Amino acid sequence: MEDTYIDSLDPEKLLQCPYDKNHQIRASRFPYHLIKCRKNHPDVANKLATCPFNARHQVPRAEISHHISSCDDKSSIEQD
Ligand SMILES: [Zn+2]
Ligand SMILES: [Zn+2]
């Protein structure tokens, strides 16, 4: 790792951020951005839970409880 032949001949690729598409962070710095960026997004920081009524309904684990009561008869319309 201190050799005379450096790896990655690419100018360091930019990885897209799952938290926000406006974030393009270099591969080596991406893991760090992955850590900090979720802390700025509690919705994803608390992870997503799968609705037992519908697999498309992935909600923050803090809101899953509220979503269950709001998805009793299903058809929970959120931003749709
Ligand atoms: Zn980000
Ligand atoms: Zn649901």
Same domain, 47 and 66: yes
Nearest to 76 by CA among 41, 46, 58: 58
6 is a domain residue: no
- Which structural domain, as residue segments, surrounds residue 29? 14-40
Rounded Cα gap, residues 5 and 75, in angstroms:
58
What's the number of domains the chain is made of?
A: 2
Nearest to 51 by CA among 22, 30, 75, 26: 75
Same domain, 22 and 33: yes
**How many Å lie between the centroid of ligand 1 and the Cα of residue 1?**
28
50 is a domain residue: yes
**How many Å lie between the centroid of ligand 1 and the Cα of residue 18?**
7
**How many Å lie between the centroid of ligand 2 and the Cα of residue 27?**
35
2 is a domain residue: no
Q: Which ligand is nearest to the CA of 32?
A: 1
Report yes or no: 75 and 67 within 8 Å, Cβ to Cβ. no
Residue 74 is given by DSSP the state S
Same domain, 49 and 69: yes
Q: Give the determination technique.
A: NMR
For the four alpha carbons of 23, 28, 32 and 35, in that order, the dihedral sign comes to positive
Binding site, by residue number, is 17, 23, 33, 37, 51, 57, 67, 71
- Phi/psi of residue 62, nearest 5 degrees: -80, -20
- What tokens appear for 52 in the block? 């037992």
